[PDB]
Design a protein around this ligand. Sequence first.
Ligand code: NAP
Ligand code: NAP
Lengths: 275, 274
Amino acid sequence: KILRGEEIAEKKAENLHGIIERSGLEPSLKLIQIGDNEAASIYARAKIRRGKKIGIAVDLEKYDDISMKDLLKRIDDLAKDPQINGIMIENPLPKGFDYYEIVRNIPYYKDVDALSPYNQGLIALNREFLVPATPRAVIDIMDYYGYHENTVTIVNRSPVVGRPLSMMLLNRNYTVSVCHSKTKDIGSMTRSSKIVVVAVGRPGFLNREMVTPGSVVIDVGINYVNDKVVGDANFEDLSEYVEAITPVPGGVGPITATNILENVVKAAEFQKNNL
Amino acid sequence: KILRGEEIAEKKAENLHGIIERSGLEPSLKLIQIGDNEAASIYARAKIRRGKKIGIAVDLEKYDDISMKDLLKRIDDLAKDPQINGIMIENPLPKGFDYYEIVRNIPYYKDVDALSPYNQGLIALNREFLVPATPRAVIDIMDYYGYHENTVTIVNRSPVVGRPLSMMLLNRNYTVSVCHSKTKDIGSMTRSSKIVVVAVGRPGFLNREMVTPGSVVIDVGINYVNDKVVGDANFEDLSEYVEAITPVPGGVGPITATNILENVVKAAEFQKNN
Ligand SMILES: NC(=O)c1ccc[n+]([C@@H]2O[C@H](COP(=O)([O-])OP(=O)(O)OC[C@H]3O[C@@H](n4cnc5c(N)ncnc54)[C@H](OP(=O)(O)O)[C@@H]3O)[C@@H](O)[C@H]2O)c1
Ligand SMILES: NC(=O)c1ccc[n+]([C@@H]2O[C@H](COP(=O)([O-])OP(=O)(O)OC[C@H]3O[C@@H](n4cnc5c(N)ncnc54)[C@H](OP(=O)(O)O)[C@@H]3O)[C@@H](O)[C@H]2O)c1
């Protein structure tokens, strides 16, 4: 009933430290950050720290201010470097810097964030190779707590969450509805599904009216309200009504970083095998 | 009541022509067919023929017996050639020949079938460039007949239909449900959407119990019974009851070839600039 993520992350990371010891890989991950976004820095250091524990070299390159020219070059140099297995650009970026074109000059087998067109392509086509960290982390919860073959409603249709997630759920035999700010009647769809994955970035959004007693709620939102961190779901309200629910913080979030490292391991071994 | 696609194809072909005049492109599309499949040959001739009418050069390369290695060579040759804008391998193939691995060898900007990873990704990313023809045709019908931002239930999760299609409907603000053989109660989900798109390839699959009077059925199945050709829906039955429905043949069917020609224009106007 309380879908915790910390214990799932540790298992993944043990499994992964396994695979590197007795495989002899030495995966490398470059991180690039532009500005001082506090969320992104915390995300960077969590990946450096878990990398260190697992055996992954993860290095952060901060830049106060960089041109498109110099940044594109830097990525180009990193892309060509065979000792660099993964490359990841952190978000948000400054104005006029578009993630989806920048990210495209990273070869897909270095694309650890897995949001480049080629990687989304293979997910779409059910030949998952590198898969984004959050949709990954939602399925982890499902795998770990025992949810299979269900109807799922995703409230979110972004490239980072609900779109690759919808395609990953179909690759695994789930029945899938996606909806969004232009859906006239969300409540109807969310009450009818076994599972509700929610990522609208709006506190209090998923309340009792949106779910049934049989509901399993996976809260992807992260909101700051009163220096405090909270998801999209009225956690307290539902935890006494719904069948199972991810708390925020402590649900999807503890897994993300490790699922990035998971991608860096797959990438580094695909490089060994193929180049 | 009757959702036909010949008006739509004809209109799209005229627009295509105008687009060719008004930029002076001479787009050319290469077809490769390996085998003697009947439907593929019809499809290829339809592309050639509509291509002739519209101002696109479409040329076809038949084979009886090709090796993987030569085909792969031929495709690299066609890809490196700047005077060939489109490349398409017809289906089906010799056994153990994986379509989806051949096609990643076609530059995404030559890939008019739009089934390659890069073009699937751009659809998913809401940055559509070349799009697959059957989902495009579904969206043609919905547009032409006034059906904007509705609930949709697609019964099909293949990469040729329901997957690109789910993504293309989301880019246009529809709300999307996707089901398949492992969905526990399909009727429950089809009856709750304004629009039901079926493409399961099973005659009589979509019957009266799984739709409503307000329902809009788009029937993508192509099935053969008594040499007669039929959809997945139960057409004679559903025509009286449902609000609108596509005939098989004659609904989505007539738009396909032209949608491939649409990508070929797009593919040509992209190549001029790059
Ligand atoms: N757990 C993690 O480590 C992690 C990772 C990634 C993201 N997130 C979080 O998840 C949330 C979304 O992430 P994102 O990158 O997907 O953001 P995004 O691009 O802004 O997506 C927001 C989505 O929510 C939908 N939405 C917003 N308000 C709605 C409403 N009132 N009714 C129905 N739909 C509504 C939007 O609909 P439209 O498409 O129509 O605009 C959009 O699809 C944020 O809270 C973000 O911080 C957390
Ligand atoms: N109209 C056109 O111009 C045109 C163009 C392309 C395709 N099509 C037609 O559309 C049909 C499908 O095309 P495709 O290439 O996508 O074929 P496909 O790859 O075999 O897809 C069949 C899909 O239908 C689902 N399905 C089959 N039986 C089902 C059942 N009993 N209950 C629920 N779902 C079921 C399958 O579920 P699973 O995923 O679980 O197997 C699968 O996702 C075929 O008849 C084909 O000829 C027509």
